[PDB]
Ligand binder design. Structure first.
Ligand SMILES: [Zn+2]
Ligand SMILES: [Zn+2]
Lengths: 75, 73
């Protein structure tokens, strides 16, 4: 399935993922094409945060769903 | 006397936009919330159409006065 990852920039990205994909693998797949580190990826899905140890099924994330990517700073 | 437009691609983006605006401070130059970890006051605006470095407390640019007076909290 295709999902949409909407960054705080306005650049929305396409990403192909399975319902069984772990949130860790979703962040690694964002790092591959965007260069963005997974430890700097705060994924938000309708107020709820995505924990790396969960899957897309654990949040009921289907195809065409739009995730929020918040970029964490180190200060 | 007119058929209303129908869509479902809403509410998830809205509730995410509301939650971020209350949990993170808006960038002074672009009104876009920017995440903050740890306790350094050195904030770098995560919007590419911005790059603006700002003091988390002072809401103004990053400067040596902010480095001596409150680099962290
Ligand atoms: Zn900004
Ligand atoms: Zn300051």
């Amino acid at each position: 399935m295709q999902i949409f990852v909407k960054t705080l920039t306005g650049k929305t990205i396409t990403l192909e993922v399975e319902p069984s994909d772990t949130i860790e693998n979703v962040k690694a797949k964002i790092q591959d094409k965007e260069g963005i580190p997974p430890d700097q990826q705060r994924l938000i899905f309708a107020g709820k945060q995505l924990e790396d140890g969960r899957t897309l099924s654990d949040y009921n994330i289907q195809k065409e769903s739009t995730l929020h990517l918040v970029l964490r700073l180190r200060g | 006397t007119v058929d209303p437009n129908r869509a479902a691609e809403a509410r998830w983006d809205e509730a995410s936009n509301v939650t971020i605006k209350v949990s993170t401070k808006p960038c002074p130059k672009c009104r876009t919330p920017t995440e903050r970890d740890g306790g350094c006051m050195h904030m770098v605006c995560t919007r590419a159409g911005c790059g603006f470095e700002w003091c988390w407390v002072c809401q103004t640019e990053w400067t040596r006065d902010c480095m001596g007076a409150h680099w962290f909290g």
